[PDB]
Structures are given as C-alpha cells and as structure tokens.
Design a protein around this motif. Structure first.
Motif, PDB file in Angstrom:
ATOM      1  N   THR A 170     -10.581  -1.740   3.406  1.00  0.00           N
ATOM      2  CA  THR A 170     -10.534  -2.923   2.556  1.00  0.00           C
ATOM      3  C   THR A 170      -9.156  -3.243   2.000  1.00  0.00           C
ATOM      4  N   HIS A 171      -8.395  -2.241   1.579  1.00  0.00           N
ATOM      5  CA  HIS A 171      -7.075  -2.558   1.056  1.00  0.00           C
ATOM      6  C   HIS A 171      -6.169  -3.163   2.107  1.00  0.00           C
ATOM      7  N   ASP A 230     -10.263  -4.244  -3.649  1.00  0.00           N
ATOM      8  CA  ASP A 230     -10.879  -2.944  -3.448  1.00  0.00           C
ATOM      9  C   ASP A 230     -12.309  -3.220  -2.959  1.00  0.00           C
ATOM     10  N   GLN A 235      -5.333  -7.252   1.771  1.00  0.00           N
ATOM     11  CA  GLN A 235      -3.905  -7.533   1.607  1.00  0.00           C
ATOM     12  C   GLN A 235      -3.341  -8.314   2.805  1.00  0.00           C
ATOM     13  N   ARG A 271      -7.835  -5.815  -6.898  1.00  0.00           N
ATOM     14  CA  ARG A 271      -6.964  -4.654  -7.054  1.00  0.00           C
ATOM     15  C   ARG A 271      -5.889  -4.921  -8.098  1.00  0.00           C
ATOM     16  N   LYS A 324     -11.616   2.712   1.461  1.00  0.00           N
ATOM     17  CA  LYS A 324     -10.419   2.330   0.737  1.00  0.00           C
ATOM     18  C   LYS A 324      -9.326   1.890   1.694  1.00  0.00           C
ATOM     19  N   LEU A 351       0.845  -1.192   0.000  1.00  0.00           N
ATOM     20  CA  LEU A 351       0.000   0.000   0.000  1.00  0.00           C
ATOM     21  C   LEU A 351       0.881   1.243   0.000  1.00  0.00           C
ATOM     22  N   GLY A 408      -4.604  -8.090  -3.534  1.00  0.00           N
ATOM     23  CA  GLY A 408      -5.420  -7.217  -2.716  1.00  0.00           C
ATOM     24  C   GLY A 408      -6.796  -7.045  -3.336  1.00  0.00           C
TER      25      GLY A 408
END
Lengths: 240, 240, 240, 240
Positions: free
Chosen positions: A96-97, B126, A101, B29, A93, A63, B124
C-alpha cells in the motif's frame, strides 16, 4: 473498552521472511485503455515512461530502504534491502505505501510530462509483493524483467512499423510476425524500414534502473550481465 | 525460456478465507503533518472529509464488488461482498487496487474541494486487509469505527474549543479533559461555549457511509443500531 | 454433489518458499515429566537418546528427501533438500508426517532401548516448520542447535554432579553455578569431581547427526566447523 | 548471545483466524498397504475402527479444547472450540500435537484390539488444519465426512460381497458397480446376498462421533440432521 475492540483479533500477520529481498511490483491497471485515451505514442512514449520513472523516484525518496528500482512499459519494481524492518516487514505495508505514493505522484507530476495532453481520469495500479531468498534470485528477477522489456520492445517496434509505415492491419502485422525469431524481426526492421534496432533509444530497449548515487538517478544500462553489479557492489553486498 | 522465469516460483498465495467479508481499510499516512501544511480546519474540515468521500466513491465505482464503505477523519474502509472472486480473493490485489485508485483520486479531485488551498505534495496512504467471518463481526467492525468517530469528535470538539475559544495551551486543554466522561465533555461544551454537541453537523458526528442506491451515495446516519440494517437488508443478505 | 463439498474452499495454502531449506523440528512434549516418570538417568540417558535417534532414522527411511537430521536431549530436526516437491512443499504435510511417524516409532521401538523400564503412557511431540533461505542460514541453524547441546550438557553435568555427588540441593547447585563461565564449570568438574569434561561420551557432548552413507548412520562429530561440510559436500551442494 | 540465535527470526506466524472453528483431520498414511499387511477384514474391521476411536479419545483427553471428533475408515477429525487460545492458535501446534499423540496411541493400544495379529511396523499419519468461519460450515464439514462414510460403506459392502461371496474378480466387481445408483447397490445386496444394508452395524454405516458426556463417549448416530445438534446444543453454542 469499546466492546467492539475485539475485532482487532481478526488482523492477520503478513511478515515477509526475514533477511530476504522484498520486492514490490506495480502495474498500471488497464493501461491499454489508458494509453489509448491519452494518445500514447506507439511503440514507445517518452512522456509516459519518464512520468513512471518520476513516480518511482518519489517512492524511493518518500519511503525507506529501497536500494534499487527497475521500470519498463507500464511497470515498476522496487527492491527493499533485506535487512529492513520498516514495518516489521508486513507485506501489506510495503504494498500500500508503494502503490499509494506512486499513484498520487502519477497524477501530481502528470503536467511535467504531458504539458498539453490533459489527464482524463485518475488511474489505478495493480500491485504485489514477492520475497526472493538470495542475491542470485533477485538478479534473475531483474534480468527477467529487463529481458521482458527487450522481447516486447523488439516485437512492438516491428509490429507498429508494419502498421504505421507499411499500412498493414493489426491482424496482418500479427500473422506476419507469427513464428518469427529475434534475428528475423531485426532483419525486417532493417530491410523493410531501414531501422537499426540497436540504435533505438536506450530507454526503450533496456528500460530504466534507479539507484542511489544523494538522489535516485536514472540509467538505461544492462543489468543482466555482471558489469552493472561489479560497478555498484554496495547494493547486493549490504549487511544481513 | 528466459532461464530467469523460475523466479515466479517465489510468488506466494495470499487468498482470503472463502465466503467471508473482506475489508480494506486505508489511513492517510502522516496526515497530522499533511493537515497542518494544508491548513485543515480544526476540529473538522469539510473539504478534507468530502474529498476523502469523493475518493471512496471513485474506488467503489472503478473496482468490483464493494457493497459498503465507511469513512471518518483520515480513514476509509471498503467492504467487499463475501461471495466475491474478483482476483481469486488475493489480499494483495484488494489492497493495492484500493490504495492506488484512492490516492490517484485524492490528487485528481483535490481542486474540487480545495479551490484555493494548493496541494503541496502527493500524499501516501496506509492500507490493510482484514477478513471477518460473519455478519455480526462485520457490523461490530463498522460500529467500532463509527464509535471511534464519535469518541474522537466529542473529544476534539471540546479540546479545540478550549484552545481556540478559551485560549488554553494545548497542554492545558489536555490536562483539563484528562479523566473526563462523555457527559462532562458535553457539559463543558454547553456551559463554557454554549455549544449543543448533538447539533453539530451529522458528518462530523457520525462520519460517512457509502452504499449503492445506481450510484454510491453518502449518508451520515447511525450504523451501530439495527435501523440502518433493517432498511438496507440487501447488503448483508446477499448470497454466499 | 454433496452440497457439503463447498467446505473444501476453506482449505488454505501453506507452501514453503521454493528452492529453500525446509526444516521440521520436534520436541518431546512435557518430557521433563516423562523423564521423571521413566527414571531417565541424569545428566544423560543413553536409552532415551538412542531411542530418539532410532525414531529419527525411521522418519528418514519412511519419508522422502531428508538429507540430514540432528538430535540432542529431547529434540530432533529434519532437513529436507531444497529442491523437494514432496507434497507441493505444504508445511502441514512436512509437519504431520514427521511428527506422527516419529511418535509411532518412539512407542514401537521403546523396548529395544528400555528392556526393563516399562512405558507408562504414549507421549506427545511438539513440532514446527522453518524455512531457511541459504546454506549459511541452515548451517547456522544446525550450529545453533549443537551449540545449545554443548551449553546444556556442560551445565547439566556440573549441576547433577553437585547434587548427586556433593549432595547440594537443586537450589544450592543453581545458586552455585549462577554467573559461572564455561571455563569455571570445567574447573569445578575437574577439582570437585575429578571429571575431565572433554572425555565425556561424544553423544552427550555433541549430540547426534544422521546422514546417508545406503542407510542413515549416526555420528557424534562437530558440525559447526567446516571439516564436516568439506567431507560431506553432497548435502549442501545438491541441485536447486 | 550465541551469535546463532538470529536464526529464530526465520520462524513464521501460522495463527488460525480468531473466533473460528479449527479442525485437524488425520489420515492413515498408505493405510491401504497397512490394512493388507495386517489382514484387516473387508469391507469393515472392528479392531481397526475401534483402535482409531481409542486413539481419538486419547487425543481429546491429553490435549485441550476439543469439543467433538468424528472418525470413519482411516480418518479422524478433531474440532477445537472457536474461543481457544491453546497455543496462540498456531496451526503447527494443533497439527503436530494431534498427529503425534494419535500415532503414539495407535501403537500403544494396538494390543487391546489386535490381541493376536502382531503390529508389523510403526505407521505414519497424514494431517492438515482447516478453519471454518461458522457453525453451518463446520456442520457441513462433518456432514461431508459422514456422507463420505455412507457412500464408501455402501460401495465397499456390495463390492466385497461380489468378490468374497460371488467370486468376481476385483475388476469384474468394479465394472459391475460402474454407473450404479444408491438404490441399485441396495437392490443387489438384497437380491444377490440377502443383505439388508440398513441393518449393518451402525459403526460401519455412520462412523463414530466423540463428544464429552466427564469422558469422551462413542456414538454411531446421524450428525447430518438437526436431531443430534438439538440434543447437544452445548457444542455449537459455546462462547466466542
């Protein structure tokens, strides 16, 4: 142009207050059951803790703008720099990211830490976003989480010693520690089990901190006091 | 009691409007790159699509109150019944539990669909939450996503046939399809490649729908028209 | 118990981030027309400005926890101390109580400032709430509004002198001041109209500031520099 | 360009869910004291009630998209059509414009209803915004408010009769009505004071409804039943 497109109007804004610290905190979902099913060592399990840290590292690497992470037990917190505009600062955002991940990594790197113990099922993670208006509030948040680590580890170490070494029943251990003070728990560990709490692994006592030094490196130091912050002024002093 | 506890005051409420449809939509993602690195078949890849569906099933099984899910390409949407109070309807809870559980599963079951192709890295996802005030708006939302599936699959099928069969350059194919209508795309598929679009696999044309029938079962039927809804009235007619 | 009560579930939370500055800013609605219909003097009208201030005083007296207010032209801002819990810090409460109390007063005390000019109709007011995370941001906000006062008054004073004294058409005056700098506007005022801008009434140049000294008293001093803040440290240094 | 402008970044979005009913409800602030100081007649005062209605009419005439208003006692609710985009549906805009315009009017038209009783001070108003997702919820909201009107008027009429006619002390009246049912209150009014509750002025019993018929006209009819809605289908059937 799809006469269905109008449904986009329903999307709501969830922008985090500008120029503020944005924190995403994750919690293993029903990890009490997960731990049992995967024979996690009590009171602490190096495999579990290090796997969590590995995931956190992956989140920081994949990220953007995360300047510090702190994890302990089944949780991990990620601090995004306050000047970030990553996704227009949309709360969803960030959430969830980080959650996705982290979860994919948890399964991906599982074998690097649990070479024998097989993963019985893909776990879930609880997540949330919090906005802290100042450097002091962010620090107090991290302190809050580290202090939580200390309180729980001190309690769990005695607790499991009483069960695993003294053979007390979970219920007996609990009543025994009921109303005890920090100094008492320390006394019991020393007298009943010849354990010097202060010599326990730093990771179990203080948790883990991740900062950029470039890759995100693990540290099991105190972050409540000023020492840590005076030594790494780049984190809290960044622009905006 | 930790003199740091005050930091909890910063947590904000993110409750979804009561008695309304709550939808969590996920998008892979940077899956354009993920697809390339994992040699996803164009225009459609059964392994990829079925893996997504498997994850969606896992999410429906591990979480609570999801009455229907719809997925296509790199996305999946989850509809929670409007009377739910799962996490006091906190948007963040819906988001992170769905995103994390999905991601962990994506990696966990990868081998059941990609027996040979190895997973190069943990991906990942979104995510977002949207509240739809009525049955009609929810339906129009699902229709919107299925219609999108149709538009994209029709375009992609011709597009890749022009590249993979006629040998046009990506840029040539694009200019060629520029300004074309649905009927034209269908005509080209039929004349140039002797392809009857309507005979393509239902999954690629309509996407996938998951409903409880108890386990969540896959269906590649139309959900824009009334037929589907008349046959499964339990979904939209539930209380609240 | 009214089988209609469920409708309360729809009320949403609108709490302002804790321990932060809460500001409510009001703007006279369509006051360009209001000013014309009530023959407001250009570039400044003592009656109008003082009436605004009187209303602001009323708001500070009738509501709770406002530590400072700043007004100019057709606006007024109210700063609530950051430790306030007046209405659980519900944004709507701050807004409506300030907007309503101000509007009622505007009409109530109209005669004390416009003894002759009759009030043609009850006006409206535009309102908003903003949360500033720090003392510096609050100060920059007030500075921003005072600086705006300065920029507009300098422009308006020359502008109206060119129309009212030189007889230029509104359009001529505008093109004339187009691209001019602060120093130029000052030069024109001095050469063309023998006006020393720095000698204009403090109220028109700096606006009005209200603080508790107990009653809320008017001051037309600078609040951008440190002087003001050093002299009234009670405002920004209050707890929380 | 003002190096202070950045403070605009702090403004937050407060958009009301699209295609939904938006209601702004106002409440006279501390109107229990206001009523006493202005000798409001108990249990009902025509001057007060009609003044409120006049204000509501002014709000409907000066603002945009309000299709129906309902007031009783010290409150008034304004329903904005669900397709409105007046201020990008910003909650704050709805709130302040309604609250301010109402408050200014309250003072402005005071003399038209209280020809003798002088206005002792400019009053304030409590306000809030609520979003109702459907026609049924909006109706249930109005019903909820009308039903509240009925419950309170029935209670207050007996209550004040017991005090003003029987000479009971406020406390005596209360204990007397404690645990009484609707039918009982009706019985007491008929036997003790020869009052037929159903013949009380419609305004006091049902409150006031304002709809466009063009100007906003007063009606003291029932809005809980279908009759009203069947007769004025234009309100709930409008687009979006």
């Amino acid at each position: 142009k799809s006469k269905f497109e109008y449904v986009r109007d329903f999307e709501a804004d969830d922008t985090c207050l500008a120029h503020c610290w944005v924190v995403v905190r994750l919690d293993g979902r029903n990890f009490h059951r997960f731990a049992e099913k995967h024979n996690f060592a009590k009171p602490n399990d190096s495999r579990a803790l290090q796997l969590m840290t590995k995931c956190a590292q992956t989140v920081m690497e994949e990220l953007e703008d995360i300047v510090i992470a702190y994890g302990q037990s089944d949780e991990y917190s990620f601090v995004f720099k306050r000047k970030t505009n990553w996704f227009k600062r949309r709360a969803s955002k960030f959430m969830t990211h980080v959650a996705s991940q982290f979860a994919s990594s948890y399964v991906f790197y599982w074998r690097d830490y649990f070479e024998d113990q097989p993963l019985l099922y893909p776990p879930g993670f609880d997540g949330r976003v919090v906005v802290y208006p100042s450097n002091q509030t962010l620090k107090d948040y991290l302190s809050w989480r580290q202090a939580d680590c200390h309180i729980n580890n001190l309690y769990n170490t005695v607790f499991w010693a009483l069960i695993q070494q003294s053979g007390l029943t979970p219920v007996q251990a609990q009543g025994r520690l009921q109303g005890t003070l920090a100094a008492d728990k320390n006394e019991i560990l020393f007298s009943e089990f010849n354990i010097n709490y202060n010599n326990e692994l730093p990771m179990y006592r203080k948790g883990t901190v991740l900062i950029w030094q470039t890759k995100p490196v693990p540290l099991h130091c105190d972050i409540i006091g000023d020492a840590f912050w005076k030594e790494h002024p780049e984190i809290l002093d960044e622009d905006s």
